[PDB]
Symmetry: C3
Subunit: 265 residues, 3 copies
């Protein structure tokens, strides 16, 4: 009796077809332009990061492959490159008239984030030498899986999965923010306002994904606007972050007095 | 000519439909109750482990994030949490009348074990400082993949995959048991009978999965009884294990004389 | 309007059905024999590597589990074993008349390579102590994913994915070859011609995969010949490599003067 096809519901792209959202035309000029812009931004950021890292000769300017033997510094590059590949799929799907198996790369919403967000969290926590560097990465991965199930499934299980992922993300993100603030309250030793604004806005960009999902679900924001905003948030979250960290963890052993093991909060 | 739909066989939930097993009603009160109990047990165990670990301040009571900078101690928590998420899916599938895409979380038998058993084996071998700590984890993962293919496929390939996974598991488990006995014959220095009973019964719980599959396949044990027994075995294998290890590897560097590199068997 | 089924194209095994290639009879005696030979070769190589590694007692002949506590030496074994499992699936699919769900193990071309090539690259770069040991592993993985999408999708997106994977592989492989030549120009201190021939032919075997795909795509080489050549290339690339490295990185700490961190190219 159990089956994957409930005959009381409709299905389409990405799983359950919400009866209140109209069909989203993936072949609109706005969508093609925005996807091209996102792919170009991510690929350019990845190439520039790779050039700036591999070309670094070390603090004393004699160590070829200085970053090659210190792999944790390259963790940013992958986060961009994988994203670029995902966006490349979108471009391919438009050359195929947004048709057939080519859509499979981005068929399920938030699935592409499974291979990026955990690595971004891991690199952010490793760069600042913070505790629970992988535990929170796994928690973010489970959040992404919860979101994938939520967007794929029918209303009841969809909302239950959303709630599960929401508490997991809330706990992990509050913990990460407290750790990062504790670490950065030592750096302060003009920079204060810009640093605080950058930190709070970077946290807000992450917090804005579930807000966008909720706005899209109940017909507040249109699907086209949601797509454009999602592309902008992905670019802002991934491209800048690596460049911001590049001028910070270059030519260091990552065990300085500033970045020693966190003590007393 | 090749196709994924052999017209000489029937198909249903989880792949091939055995013509000798009746359809298993996933919407039975017993199944809902047992799945709720399993989810509650796994989630409670995960939360209690997380609280007891993150709250540990170190041997001298001055190291906040003592476990945060020693990640290998948290490897237990993930094993539970992932399991809980899997069980959460079951609960979601019952709120959706055991219908539609919601079943996809537990569509394929033993697939959920792919992300838990390797981590459990890795943590068990790392805690006791034993050799081949990852090789046996990968072997267990390949065993889980073999079981997934076995349950998914039609009789001939099903039995061949079962046989392959069976020898892999036999070799890996005998090796692990010999290593664990060699390590624990030093600890003995009242505890002997309880420790031996706990160790042998924990090994028996792992050994009982293929036995349950064989009993279910040939109509000895009913599918409902198999489901209840599988839930009990999962709880026993995962919830207790972490709590048992918690009072052992707390506030240590994991390189003591007892847990030095194994020598002479 | 978007759907995974473009009605202007045909579909079959592995995704898009090329209208210029005839249906490939997977139940031909040549295919069964070649798959059996490949499975036997990979499994025998894995078993012999495992026996020769686990049985090593260390440089001074007193360290049981010498390789067990030095895991990076076993990275070869997994590369073979996983491959064997994949080939096992093929054998299973022939016992099921090349029918039904059993084909799912090898439904998508190059998907099986996702879990082998990255590990092979990682082990090769780690054994010689070379930089970017994981970055190039991830690049090879993304190349394999690009190839999977290329073979799965319809002509336009297929060729675009092929081009993307082709540049990624070109960059990564030229970088790896330059690093390996730089490392091995120190070893030279009769061996020169055999070593150079082995190195260049091993690189050529890797370079020959996209060449085989291009030859198959445009009806130059027949599908049966492509299958046999692919099996031979897999055996040559995986079985020999581990045995070649076995007599090199046995009973060493992997930080000798020859294998110190690469300097000045
Ligand atoms: C197969 C996957 C393996 C994944 C991790 C490889 C590293 C294993 C440990 C190692 O090499 O030694 C420690 C290495 C160096 O070893 P060493 O210090 O002995 O030399 O040091 C590290 O701790 C670096 C690990 C960084 C790992 C970053 C992973 C990013 C990509 C993950 C996949 C993303 C999804 C796919 C797209
Ligand atoms: C690691 C995980 C890598 C996943 C690799 C990509 C492919 C995953 C499979 C996608 C679904 C394929 C089958 C399908 O379409 O079936 C249609 C079926 C039924 O459709 P229908 O055809 O009946 O309509 O529906 C689904 O599959 C629903 C979507 C389920 C997707 C599940 C996989 C993604 C979630 C993985 C989370 C892993 C978390 C681990 C943490 C990692 C941290 C680093
Ligand atoms: C992307 C996946 C990466 C997986 C491993 C991350 C660790 C890489 C090495 C590292 O950080 O340095 C060594 C780190 C600390 O690095 P350090 O000592 O340089 O600081 O030390 C370790 O060896 C700890 C590794 C524990 C890994 C446990 C993994 C459990 C979860 C796996 C996924 C399960 C399936 C999904 C659900
Ligand atoms: C790592 C692996 C993560 C896997 C992530 C979950 C999703 C995997 C895909 C499931 C199948 C989706 C498609 C499907 O339903 O097709 C129906 C088809 C045809 O059905 P039909 O519709 O024709 O009927 O059947 C199958 O797919 C059969 C089941 C095959 C399942 C294979 C994937 C699981 C095994 C992975 C083993 C990996 C071992 C690595 C070791 C790891 C150690 C840490
Ligand atoms: C879950 C997956 C985890 C994958 C990596 C495990 C190693 C994590 C780090 C660790 O244990 O400490 C460093 C360990 C030992 O830790 P130690 O030195 O603290 O002891 O040393 C290493 O750097 C060895 C890492 C080798 C990893 C090779 C992975 C091959 C298989 C990958 C999966 C392939 C696909 C599936 C089929
Ligand atoms: C890590 C990734 C592990 C992947 C585990 C195996 C299963 C993956 C899913 C296969 C497709 C299942 C669904 C299907 O058949 O749908 C039919 C649909 C539609 O078919 P249709 O039925 O409409 O016709 O088509 C496809 O799925 C097209 C093939 C897409 C395959 C995508 C997964 C493989 C690529 C993963 C790359 C990951 C790179 C990470 C780097 C790792 C480095 C170590
Ligand atoms: C580059 C892409 C990034 C950083 C994406 C991040 C995505 C999230 C943090 C998503 C979070 C979600 C929840 C907290 C609730 C469930 C829905 C999600 C997946 C959108
Ligand atoms: C928490 C869940 C756990 C520990 C599950 C463990 C499962 C196994 C050890 C399964 C083993 C199997 C075989 C040895 C043969 C093939 C069938 C399996 C997968 C049930
Ligand atoms: C044991 C199997 C091995 C080593 C397989 C290796 C495969 C490749 C290096 C494949 C490379 C490809 C490209 C560079 C272009 C796209 C097509 C591929 C995947 C065949």
């Amino acid at each position: 009796a159990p089956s994957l096809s409930d005959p009381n519901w409709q299905y389409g792209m990405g799983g359950w077809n919400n009866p209140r959202l109209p069909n989203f035309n993936l072949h609109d000029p706005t969508v093609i332009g925005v996807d091209w812009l996102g792919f170009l931004c991510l690929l350019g950021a990845s190439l520039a990061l790779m050039y700036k890292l591999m070309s670094f000769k070390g603090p004393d300017g004699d160590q070829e492959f200085f970053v090659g033997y210190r792999e944790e510094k390259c963790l940013s590059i992958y986060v961009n490159l994988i994203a670029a590949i995902t966006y490349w799929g979108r471009i391919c799907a438009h050359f195929n008239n947004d048709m057939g198996l080519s859509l499979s790369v981005n068929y399920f919403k938030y699935l592409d984030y499974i291979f990026t967000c955990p690595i971004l969290t891991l690199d952010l926590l490793w760069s600042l030498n913070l505790p629970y560097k992988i535990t929170y990465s796994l928690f973010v991965g489970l959040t992404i899986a919860c979101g994938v199930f939520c967007n794929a499934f029918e209303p009841p299980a969809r909302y239950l999965w959303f709630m599960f992922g929401c508490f997991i993300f809330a706990f992990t993100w509050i913990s990460i923010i407290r750790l990062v603030y504790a670490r950065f309250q030592q750096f302060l030793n003009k920079i204060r306002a810009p640093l605080k604004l950058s930190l709070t806005l970077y946290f807000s960009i992450w917090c804005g994904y579930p807000a966008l999902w909720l706005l899209t679900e109940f017909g507040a924001i249109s699907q086209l606007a949601a797509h454009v905003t999602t592309v902008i948030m992905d670019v802002a979250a991934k491209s800048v972050y690596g460049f911001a960290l590049l001028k910070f963890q270059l030519g260091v052993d990552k065990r300085d007095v500033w970045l020693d093991e966190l003590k007393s909060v």
